[PDB]
CSV table of C-alpha atoms and ligand atoms in Angstrom, one decimal:
chain,number,residue,atom,x,y,z
A,1,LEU,CA,4.5,-4.9,-72.3
A,2,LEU,CA,5.6,-7.6,-74.7
A,3,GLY,CA,2.9,-10.1,-73.7
A,4,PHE,CA,0.0,-7.8,-74.2
A,5,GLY,CA,1.6,-6.4,-77.3
A,6,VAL,CA,1.8,-9.4,-79.1
A,7,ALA,CA,-1.6,-10.6,-77.9
A,8,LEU,CA,-3.2,-7.2,-79.1
A,9,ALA,CA,-1.2,-7.1,-82.4
A,10,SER,CA,-2.1,-10.6,-83.2
A,11,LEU,CA,-5.8,-9.8,-82.6
A,12,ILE,CA,-6.1,-7.1,-85.6
A,13,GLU,CA,-7.1,-8.4,-88.9
A,14,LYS,CA,-5.8,-7.2,-92.2
A,15,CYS,CA,-4.4,-3.6,-92.5
A,16,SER,CA,-7.4,-1.9,-94.0
A,17,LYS,CA,-9.0,-1.7,-97.4
A,18,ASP,CA,-6.2,1.0,-98.1
A,19,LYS,CA,-3.4,-0.5,-96.2
A,20,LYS,CA,-3.4,2.3,-93.8
A,21,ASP,CA,-6.4,3.0,-91.4
A,22,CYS,CA,-6.9,2.5,-87.5
A,23,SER,CA,-3.9,0.3,-87.6
A,24,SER,CA,-2.4,1.8,-84.3
A,25,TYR,CA,-2.2,-1.9,-83.1
A,26,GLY,CA,-1.5,-3.2,-86.3
A,27,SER,CA,1.9,-5.1,-86.2
A,28,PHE,CA,3.8,-6.1,-82.8
A,29,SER,CA,6.2,-3.0,-82.8
A,30,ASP,CA,3.3,-0.7,-83.2
A,31,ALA,CA,1.2,-2.3,-80.7
A,32,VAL,CA,4.1,-2.1,-78.2
A,33,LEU,CA,4.7,1.6,-78.9
A,34,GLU,CA,1.1,2.3,-78.3
A,35,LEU,CA,1.0,0.3,-74.8
A,36,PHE,CA,4.2,2.1,-74.1
A,37,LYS,CA,2.3,5.5,-74.7
A,38,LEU,CA,-0.5,4.7,-72.4
A,39,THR,CA,2.0,4.2,-69.5
A,40,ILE,CA,3.5,7.4,-69.8
A,41,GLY,CA,0.4,9.1,-70.3
A,42,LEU,CA,0.7,10.4,-73.9
A,43,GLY,CA,-1.4,10.4,-77.1
A,44,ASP,CA,-4.9,9.4,-77.1
A,45,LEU,CA,-6.6,6.2,-76.4
A,46,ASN,CA,-8.3,4.7,-79.5
A,47,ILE,CA,-10.3,1.7,-79.1
A,48,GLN,CA,-12.1,1.9,-82.6
A,49,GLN,CA,-9.5,-0.6,-84.3
A,50,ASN,CA,-10.4,-2.7,-87.2
A,51,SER,CA,-10.7,-5.6,-84.9
A,52,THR,CA,-12.7,-8.9,-85.1
A,53,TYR,CA,-13.6,-8.7,-81.4
A,54,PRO,CA,-14.1,-5.2,-79.8
A,55,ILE,CA,-14.9,-6.8,-76.4
A,56,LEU,CA,-11.7,-8.9,-76.2
A,57,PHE,CA,-9.7,-5.9,-77.3
A,58,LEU,CA,-11.1,-3.8,-74.5
A,59,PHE,CA,-10.7,-6.8,-72.0
A,60,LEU,CA,-7.1,-7.0,-72.7
A,61,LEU,CA,-6.3,-3.2,-73.0
A,62,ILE,CA,-8.1,-2.8,-69.6
A,63,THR,CA,-6.2,-5.6,-68.0
A,64,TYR,CA,-2.9,-4.1,-69.2
A,65,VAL,CA,-4.1,-0.6,-67.5
A,66,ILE,CA,-4.8,-2.5,-64.3
A,67,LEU,CA,-1.5,-4.3,-64.1
A,68,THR,CA,0.8,-1.3,-65.1
A,69,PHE,CA,-1.0,2.1,-64.2
A,70,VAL,CA,-2.6,0.6,-60.8
A,71,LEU,CA,-0.4,-2.4,-59.5
A,72,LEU,CA,3.1,-1.9,-60.7
A,73,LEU,CA,3.7,1.8,-60.9
A,74,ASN,CA,2.3,2.4,-57.3
A,75,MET,CA,3.8,-0.7,-56.0
A,76,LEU,CA,7.3,0.9,-57.2
A,77,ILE,CA,6.9,4.0,-55.2
A,78,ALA,CA,5.9,1.8,-52.1
A,79,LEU,CA,9.1,-0.5,-52.4
A,80,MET,CA,11.1,2.6,-53.2
B,1,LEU,CA,16.9,17.4,-69.2
B,2,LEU,CA,19.8,19.7,-70.8
B,3,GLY,CA,21.9,16.7,-71.5
B,4,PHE,CA,19.7,14.5,-73.6
B,5,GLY,CA,17.9,17.8,-74.9
B,6,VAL,CA,21.2,18.8,-76.7
B,7,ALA,CA,22.0,14.8,-77.7
B,8,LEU,CA,18.7,14.5,-79.3
B,9,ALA,CA,18.7,17.8,-80.9
B,10,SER,CA,22.1,17.2,-82.4
B,11,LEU,CA,20.9,13.8,-83.9
B,12,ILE,CA,18.4,15.5,-85.9
B,13,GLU,CA,19.6,16.5,-89.6
B,14,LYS,CA,18.6,19.5,-91.8
B,15,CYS,CA,15.4,20.9,-91.1
B,16,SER,CA,13.3,19.6,-94.0
B,17,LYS,CA,13.0,19.7,-97.8
B,18,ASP,CA,10.7,22.8,-96.9
B,19,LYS,CA,12.4,24.0,-93.8
B,20,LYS,CA,9.3,23.1,-91.7
B,21,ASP,CA,8.1,19.5,-91.1
B,22,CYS,CA,8.7,16.7,-88.4
B,23,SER,CA,11.1,19.2,-86.7
B,24,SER,CA,9.9,18.8,-83.3
B,25,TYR,CA,13.6,18.0,-82.1
B,26,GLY,CA,15.1,20.2,-84.3
B,27,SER,CA,17.1,22.6,-82.5
B,28,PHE,CA,18.2,22.7,-78.5
B,29,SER,CA,15.3,24.7,-77.0
B,30,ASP,CA,12.8,22.8,-79.2
B,31,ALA,CA,14.1,19.5,-77.8
B,32,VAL,CA,14.3,20.7,-74.4
B,33,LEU,CA,10.7,21.9,-74.7
B,34,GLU,CA,9.5,18.3,-76.1
B,35,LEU,CA,11.4,16.4,-73.2
B,36,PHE,CA,9.6,18.8,-70.8
B,37,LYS,CA,6.1,17.9,-72.1
B,38,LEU,CA,7.1,14.1,-71.7
B,39,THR,CA,7.9,14.5,-68.3
B,40,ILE,CA,4.4,16.6,-67.4
B,41,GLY,CA,2.5,14.1,-69.5
B,42,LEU,CA,1.2,16.4,-72.1
B,43,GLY,CA,1.4,16.2,-76.3
B,44,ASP,CA,1.7,13.3,-78.4
B,45,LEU,CA,5.2,11.2,-78.4
B,46,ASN,CA,6.2,11.2,-82.0
B,47,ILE,CA,9.4,9.3,-82.8
B,48,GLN,CA,8.8,9.7,-86.7
B,49,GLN,CA,11.6,12.2,-86.9
B,50,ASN,CA,13.6,13.2,-89.9
B,51,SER,CA,16.4,11.3,-88.0
B,52,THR,CA,19.6,9.5,-89.4
B,53,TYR,CA,19.2,6.8,-86.7
B,54,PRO,CA,15.8,5.8,-85.5
B,55,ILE,CA,17.2,3.0,-83.0
B,56,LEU,CA,19.6,5.5,-81.6
B,57,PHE,CA,16.7,8.0,-81.3
B,58,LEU,CA,14.6,5.7,-79.5
B,59,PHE,CA,17.4,4.7,-77.2
B,60,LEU,CA,18.2,8.0,-76.1
B,61,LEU,CA,14.5,8.9,-75.4
B,62,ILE,CA,13.6,5.8,-73.6
B,63,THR,CA,16.5,6.1,-71.5
B,64,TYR,CA,15.3,9.5,-70.6
B,65,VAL,CA,11.9,8.2,-69.9
B,66,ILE,CA,13.5,5.5,-67.6
B,67,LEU,CA,15.7,8.0,-65.8
B,68,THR,CA,12.9,10.5,-64.9
B,69,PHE,CA,9.4,9.2,-65.1
B,70,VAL,CA,10.6,6.0,-63.4
B,71,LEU,CA,13.6,6.6,-61.1
B,72,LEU,CA,13.6,10.4,-60.3
B,73,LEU,CA,10.0,11.1,-59.9
B,74,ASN,CA,9.1,8.3,-57.8
B,75,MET,CA,12.3,8.8,-55.8
B,76,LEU,CA,11.1,12.0,-55.1
B,77,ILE,CA,8.0,10.9,-53.5
B,78,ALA,CA,10.0,8.3,-51.5
B,79,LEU,CA,12.4,11.0,-50.1
B,80,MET,CA,9.6,13.4,-49.4
C,1,POV,C1,7.2,3.2,-67.2
C,1,POV,C2,8.1,2.8,-68.4
C,1,POV,C3,9.5,2.8,-68.3
C,1,POV,C4,10.2,2.3,-69.2
C,1,POV,C5,9.9,1.1,-69.9
C,1,POV,C6,10.6,0.9,-71.4
C,1,POV,C7,10.2,-0.4,-72.0
C,1,POV,C8,10.8,-0.6,-73.6
C,1,POV,C9,9.9,0.2,-74.5
C,1,POV,C10,9.9,0.1,-75.8
C,1,POV,C11,8.9,0.3,-77.0
C,1,POV,C12,9.4,1.6,-77.8
C,1,POV,C13,8.9,1.2,-79.2
C,1,POV,C14,9.8,0.0,-79.9
C,1,POV,C15,9.1,-0.1,-81.4
C,1,POV,C16,9.1,1.4,-82.1
C,1,POV,C17,9.2,0.9,-83.4
C,1,POV,C18,10.6,0.5,-84.2
C,1,POV,O1,11.4,1.3,-84.0
C,1,POV,O2,10.8,-0.5,-84.6
C,1,POV,C19,12.2,-1.1,-85.0
C,1,POV,C20,12.8,-1.7,-83.6
C,1,POV,O3,12.8,-0.3,-82.6
C,1,POV,C21,13.7,-0.8,-81.6
C,1,POV,O4,14.2,-1.7,-81.4
C,1,POV,C22,13.4,0.2,-80.3
C,1,POV,C23,14.7,0.8,-80.0
C,1,POV,C24,15.6,-0.1,-79.0
C,1,POV,C25,14.5,-0.7,-78.1
C,1,POV,C26,14.3,0.1,-76.8
C,1,POV,C27,15.2,0.8,-76.0
C,1,POV,C28,16.0,-0.6,-75.2
C,1,POV,C29,15.9,-0.1,-73.4
C,1,POV,C30,17.0,0.7,-73.4
C,1,POV,C31,17.2,0.7,-71.7
C,1,POV,C32,18.3,1.5,-71.3
C,1,POV,C33,18.5,1.7,-69.9
C,1,POV,C34,19.7,2.6,-69.5
C,1,POV,C35,21.1,2.0,-70.0
C,1,POV,C36,22.1,2.9,-69.6
C,1,POV,C37,12.2,-1.9,-86.1
C,1,POV,O5,11.6,-1.7,-87.1
C,1,POV,P1,11.6,-2.5,-88.6
C,1,POV,O6,10.7,-3.6,-88.3
C,1,POV,O7,13.0,-2.6,-89.0
C,1,POV,O8,10.8,-1.5,-89.6
C,1,POV,C38,10.8,-1.8,-91.1
C,1,POV,C39,10.1,-0.7,-91.8
C,1,POV,N1,10.9,0.7,-92.0
C,1,POV,C40,12.3,0.5,-91.9
C,1,POV,C41,10.4,1.4,-93.1
C,1,POV,C42,10.5,1.4,-90.6
C,2,POV,C1,9.0,17.7,-63.3
C,2,POV,C2,9.3,18.8,-64.1
C,2,POV,C3,9.5,20.0,-63.2
C,2,POV,C4,10.0,21.3,-63.6
C,2,POV,C5,11.3,21.5,-64.3
C,2,POV,C6,11.6,22.7,-65.2
C,2,POV,C7,12.9,22.8,-65.8
C,2,POV,C8,13.1,23.9,-66.9
C,2,POV,C9,12.3,23.7,-68.2
C,2,POV,C10,12.5,24.4,-69.1
C,2,POV,C11,11.9,24.3,-70.5
C,2,POV,C12,10.8,25.0,-71.0
C,2,POV,C13,11.1,25.6,-72.5
C,2,POV,C14,12.5,26.2,-72.9
C,2,POV,C15,12.6,26.7,-74.3
C,2,POV,C16,11.5,27.3,-75.2
C,2,POV,C17,11.5,28.1,-76.2
C,2,POV,C18,12.1,29.4,-75.8
C,2,POV,O1,11.1,30.2,-75.3
C,2,POV,O2,13.2,29.8,-76.2
C,2,POV,C19,13.8,31.0,-75.8
C,2,POV,C20,14.1,31.0,-74.4
C,2,POV,O3,13.1,30.7,-73.5
C,2,POV,C21,13.7,30.4,-72.2
C,2,POV,O4,14.7,31.0,-71.6
C,2,POV,C22,12.6,29.8,-71.5
C,2,POV,C23,12.0,30.6,-70.2
C,2,POV,C24,13.2,30.8,-69.1
C,2,POV,C25,13.7,29.5,-68.4
C,2,POV,C26,12.5,28.6,-68.0
C,2,POV,C27,12.1,28.8,-66.3
C,2,POV,C28,13.4,28.9,-65.7
C,2,POV,C29,13.1,27.9,-64.3
C,2,POV,C30,12.1,29.1,-63.7
C,2,POV,C31,12.1,28.2,-62.0
C,2,POV,C32,11.4,29.2,-61.0
C,2,POV,C33,11.3,28.5,-59.7
C,2,POV,C34,10.7,29.4,-58.5
C,2,POV,C35,11.2,30.7,-58.3
C,2,POV,C36,10.5,31.7,-57.2
C,2,POV,C37,14.7,31.7,-76.9
C,2,POV,O5,14.2,31.7,-78.1
C,2,POV,P1,15.2,32.4,-79.2
C,2,POV,O6,16.2,31.3,-79.6
C,2,POV,O7,15.6,33.8,-78.9
C,2,POV,O8,14.2,32.3,-80.4
C,2,POV,C38,14.5,33.0,-81.6
C,2,POV,C39,13.6,33.0,-82.7
C,2,POV,N1,12.4,33.8,-82.3
C,2,POV,C40,12.4,35.1,-81.7
C,2,POV,C41,11.4,34.0,-83.5
C,2,POV,C42,11.5,32.7,-81.7
C,3,PLC,C1,14.8,-6.2,-73.6
C,3,PLC,C2,14.3,-5.1,-74.5
C,3,PLC,C3,13.2,-4.3,-73.9
C,3,PLC,C4,12.6,-3.1,-75.1
C,3,PLC,C5,11.8,-3.5,-76.1
C,3,PLC,C6,12.3,-4.0,-77.4
C,3,PLC,C7,11.6,-4.6,-78.4
C,3,PLC,C8,10.6,-3.9,-78.9
C,3,PLC,C9,9.6,-4.3,-80.1
C,3,PLC,C10,11.0,-4.6,-81.4
C,3,PLC,C11,9.8,-5.4,-82.4
C,3,PLC,C12,10.7,-5.2,-83.8
C,3,PLC,O1,11.5,-4.4,-84.2
C,3,PLC,O2,10.5,-6.4,-84.3
C,3,PLC,C13,9.8,-7.4,-83.6
C,3,PLC,C14,9.6,-8.7,-84.7
C,3,PLC,C15,9.1,-8.3,-86.1
C,3,PLC,O3,8.2,-7.6,-86.0
C,3,PLC,P1,7.1,-7.2,-87.1
C,3,PLC,O4,6.0,-8.0,-86.8
C,3,PLC,O5,7.8,-7.7,-88.4
C,3,PLC,O6,6.6,-5.8,-87.2
C,3,PLC,C16,7.4,-4.6,-87.7
C,3,PLC,C17,6.5,-3.6,-87.8
C,3,PLC,N1,7.1,-2.3,-88.5
C,3,PLC,C18,7.4,-2.5,-89.9
C,3,PLC,C19,6.0,-1.4,-88.6
C,3,PLC,C20,8.0,-1.7,-87.8
C,3,PLC,O7,9.1,-9.9,-84.2
C,3,PLC,C21,7.8,-10.1,-84.1
C,3,PLC,O8,7.1,-9.5,-84.6
C,3,PLC,C22,7.6,-11.2,-83.3
C,3,PLC,C23,6.6,-11.2,-82.1
C,3,PLC,C24,6.4,-12.4,-81.3
C,3,PLC,C25,7.8,-12.9,-80.6
C,3,PLC,C26,8.0,-12.0,-79.4
C,3,PLC,C27,7.3,-12.0,-78.2
C,3,PLC,C28,7.7,-11.4,-77.0
C,3,PLC,C29,7.0,-12.0,-75.6
C,3,PLC,C30,7.9,-11.5,-74.4
C,3,PLC,C31,9.2,-12.1,-74.1
C,3,PLC,C32,9.9,-11.7,-72.8
C,4,PLC,C1,-15.7,-11.1,-66.4
C,4,PLC,C2,-14.8,-12.0,-66.7
C,4,PLC,C3,-14.4,-12.0,-68.1
C,4,PLC,C4,-13.2,-13.1,-68.5
C,4,PLC,C5,-12.7,-12.6,-69.9
C,4,PLC,C6,-13.7,-13.1,-70.8
C,4,PLC,C7,-13.4,-12.5,-72.2
C,4,PLC,C8,-13.8,-11.0,-72.4
C,4,PLC,C9,-15.1,-11.1,-73.2
C,4,PLC,C10,-14.9,-11.4,-74.7
C,4,PLC,C11,-16.2,-12.1,-75.5
C,4,PLC,C12,-16.2,-12.3,-76.6
C,4,PLC,O1,-16.2,-11.5,-77.6
C,4,PLC,O2,-16.1,-13.7,-77.2
C,4,PLC,C13,-15.6,-14.4,-75.9
C,4,PLC,C14,-15.5,-16.0,-76.6
C,4,PLC,C15,-16.8,-16.7,-76.9
C,4,PLC,O3,-17.5,-15.8,-78.0
C,4,PLC,P1,-19.1,-16.5,-78.3
C,4,PLC,O4,-19.7,-16.6,-76.9
C,4,PLC,O5,-18.7,-17.7,-79.0
C,4,PLC,O6,-19.7,-15.4,-79.2
C,4,PLC,C16,-19.9,-14.0,-78.4
C,4,PLC,C17,-20.9,-13.0,-79.3
C,4,PLC,N1,-22.1,-13.6,-79.5
C,4,PLC,C18,-22.9,-14.5,-78.4
C,4,PLC,C19,-23.1,-12.7,-79.7
C,4,PLC,C20,-22.0,-14.6,-80.6
C,4,PLC,O7,-14.7,-16.6,-75.5
C,4,PLC,C21,-14.2,-17.8,-75.8
C,4,PLC,O8,-14.3,-18.3,-76.7
C,4,PLC,C22,-14.1,-18.5,-74.5
C,4,PLC,C23,-13.2,-17.9,-73.5
C,4,PLC,C24,-13.3,-18.3,-72.1
C,4,PLC,C25,-12.2,-17.7,-71.3
C,4,PLC,C26,-12.2,-18.2,-69.8
C,4,PLC,C27,-10.9,-17.6,-69.2
C,4,PLC,C28,-10.8,-16.4,-68.9
C,4,PLC,C29,-9.6,-15.7,-68.1
C,4,PLC,C30,-9.6,-14.2,-67.7
C,5,PLC,C1,19.0,26.9,-65.1
C,5,PLC,C2,17.8,27.0,-66.2
C,5,PLC,C3,17.0,25.7,-66.3
C,5,PLC,C4,15.8,25.8,-67.2
C,5,PLC,C5,16.3,25.7,-68.4
C,5,PLC,C6,16.8,26.9,-69.2
C,5,PLC,C7,17.2,26.7,-70.7
C,5,PLC,C8,16.2,26.1,-71.8
C,5,PLC,C9,16.8,26.2,-73.1
C,5,PLC,C10,17.1,27.6,-73.6
C,5,PLC,C11,17.9,27.4,-75.0
C,5,PLC,C12,18.0,28.9,-75.6
C,5,PLC,O1,17.3,29.5,-75.7
C,5,PLC,O2,19.0,29.0,-76.2
C,5,PLC,C13,20.1,28.0,-76.2
C,5,PLC,C14,21.1,28.4,-77.1
C,5,PLC,C15,21.0,28.6,-78.6
C,5,PLC,O3,19.8,27.8,-79.1
C,5,PLC,P1,19.8,27.6,-80.5
C,5,PLC,O4,20.4,26.0,-80.8
C,5,PLC,O5,19.8,28.5,-81.5
C,5,PLC,O6,18.0,27.0,-80.6
C,5,PLC,C16,17.0,28.1,-80.8
C,5,PLC,C17,15.8,27.4,-81.3
C,5,PLC,N1,14.7,28.6,-81.6
C,5,PLC,C18,15.1,29.6,-82.6
C,5,PLC,C19,13.4,27.8,-82.3
C,5,PLC,C20,14.2,28.9,-80.2
C,5,PLC,O7,22.4,27.4,-76.9
C,5,PLC,C21,22.4,26.2,-77.8
C,5,PLC,O8,21.6,25.8,-78.4
C,5,PLC,C22,23.5,25.6,-77.2
C,5,PLC,C23,23.4,24.3,-76.7
C,5,PLC,C24,24.5,23.5,-76.3
C,5,PLC,C25,25.2,24.0,-74.9
C,5,PLC,C26,24.3,23.8,-73.7
C,5,PLC,C27,24.3,22.4,-73.1
C,5,PLC,C28,23.9,22.4,-71.6
C,5,PLC,C29,24.1,21.0,-71.0
C,5,PLC,C30,23.7,20.9,-69.7
C,5,PLC,C31,24.4,21.9,-68.6
C,5,PLC,C32,24.0,21.7,-67.0
C,6,PLC,C1,21.4,-3.3,-75.5
C,6,PLC,C2,22.3,-2.1,-75.1
C,6,PLC,C3,22.6,-1.2,-76.1
C,6,PLC,C4,23.4,-0.2,-75.8
C,6,PLC,C5,23.2,1.3,-76.9
C,6,PLC,C6,23.5,0.9,-78.2
C,6,PLC,C7,23.0,2.2,-79.2
C,6,PLC,C8,21.6,1.6,-79.4
C,6,PLC,C9,21.7,0.9,-80.9
C,6,PLC,C10,21.8,1.9,-82.0
C,6,PLC,C11,22.3,1.1,-83.2
C,6,PLC,C12,22.7,2.2,-84.4
C,6,PLC,O1,21.8,2.6,-85.2
C,6,PLC,O2,23.9,2.2,-84.7
C,6,PLC,C13,25.0,1.7,-83.6
C,6,PLC,C14,26.3,2.2,-83.9
C,6,PLC,C15,26.9,1.3,-84.9
C,6,PLC,O3,26.1,1.0,-86.0
C,6,PLC,P1,26.6,-0.1,-87.1
C,6,PLC,O4,26.9,-1.5,-86.6
C,6,PLC,O5,27.8,0.6,-87.9
C,6,PLC,O6,25.3,0.0,-88.2
C,6,PLC,C16,24.2,-0.4,-87.8
C,6,PLC,C17,23.2,-0.7,-89.1
C,6,PLC,N1,23.9,-1.8,-90.0
C,6,PLC,C18,24.4,-3.0,-89.2
C,6,PLC,C19,22.4,-2.2,-90.8
C,6,PLC,C20,24.7,-1.0,-90.9
C,6,PLC,O7,27.0,2.3,-82.7
C,6,PLC,C21,28.4,2.4,-82.7
C,6,PLC,O8,28.9,3.1,-83.8
C,6,PLC,C22,28.9,2.0,-81.4
C,6,PLC,C23,28.3,2.4,-80.1
C,6,PLC,C24,28.7,1.7,-79.1
C,6,PLC,C25,28.2,2.1,-77.7
C,6,PLC,C26,28.8,1.2,-76.7
C,6,PLC,C27,28.3,1.9,-75.2
C,6,PLC,C28,26.9,2.0,-74.9
C,6,PLC,C29,26.5,2.6,-73.9
C,6,PLC,C30,25.0,2.8,-73.4
């Protein structure tokens, strides 16, 4: 959560032309909150960020989904 | 559900300056409904409440998520 939170957050450029737009993954704690809400399954996944690399953003975000929604949570049920 | 419902609800101060704003966790039954919808996975988690302690609010809300979304539901699948 914290590794991909800081990576995704540091990938986003300046806030906006008006300081508040599509800055979901703006800072660290805001990106950590967005990833937490993808694990719970709440909200709406929005990839149209003010990002310099949309492909690298999708790669890190989909890797996070594969590592937690698929591997870690189902492996928790199996070990339990 | 009811323990954290009444705790989170009693943490929120007066309704608003207009009696209706960001009062998701306003009263008891409204906070119980919001927690129920986090368990089902519906809605959108909004922590920007008219709260006096945003940190204590996150602590109680994340503890609820750890106790039900992680422990209790997966342990239900294991015992079943
Ligand atoms: C499958 C999942 C399982 C669960 C996984 C959970 C993983 C964790 C997920 C956590 C991510 C949640 C979001 C964090 C960031 C939100 C923003 C925020 O509030 O920032 C603040 C910090 O806020 C905190 O420090 C959050 C509260 C404490 C940490 C969380 C609980 C710790 C775990 C408890 C466990 C208890 C266990 C039981 C114990 C008996 C900082 O804000 P600021 O920079 O000061 O703002 C300045 C500007 N402003 C003042 C105008 C605003
Ligand atoms: C993983 C999860 C699993 C499920 C967990 C579920 C846990 C439970 C979750 C419950 C939380 C749901 C929300 C409750 C509060 C909503 C608000 C509300 O209506 O308030 C009202 C009460 O409302 C009730 O009393 C709700 C209905 C009855 C209880 C729920 C069903 C009982 C379980 C059945 C089981 C059957 C089993 C099978 C039997 C064969 C009160 O409103 P008011 O104060 O009078 O309003 C005044 C102002 N106004 C009139 C203008 C409005
Ligand atoms: C054990 C606890 C588990 C639960 C999670 C608790 C922490 C949640 C996030 C809190 C953030 C906060 O509040 O501060 C985080 C602070 C400052 O944040 P900021 O950049 O000013 O953004 C604030 C944005 N606002 C104003 C909108 C709120 O440091 C940082 O940004 C540094 C980030 C890089 C260092 C950390 C990397 C960690 C890697 C993994 C190590 C294991
Ligand atoms: C299927 C396996 C995928 C592995 C992951 C790759 C990253 C995802 C794609 C993003 C592409 C992009 O946006 O940039 C990727 C950039 C290069 O970009 P560029 O070629 O200079 O320009 C691209 C745009 N052009 C051509 C129009 C100008 O990478 C690098 O600097 C090197 C990264 C190497 C990573 C090796 C280790 C990977 C570990 C996992
Ligand atoms: C066994 C049944 C399971 C399913 C759940 C059923 C109940 C759901 C909620 C109904 C609420 C309601 O309707 O009344 C709850 C009432 C009055 O509510 P109010 O504060 O006026 O808010 C009404 C808000 N409105 C107007 C928007 C609807 O008491 C209370 O607030 C007292 C709360 C503290 C005492 C109870 C604590 C319980 C702790 C756990 C014990 C095991
Ligand atoms: C990692 C383990 C966390 C345990 C849970 C702690 C609560 C979460 C953080 C909220 C902080 C806050 O907002 O307030 C917490 C308040 C104290 O606040 P303060 O120091 O007076 O002011 C803070 C703001 N200042 C410094 C800028 C003025 O707590 C108390 O009165 C004592 C609570 C003790 C709890 C011990 C048992 C815990 C069981 C679990």
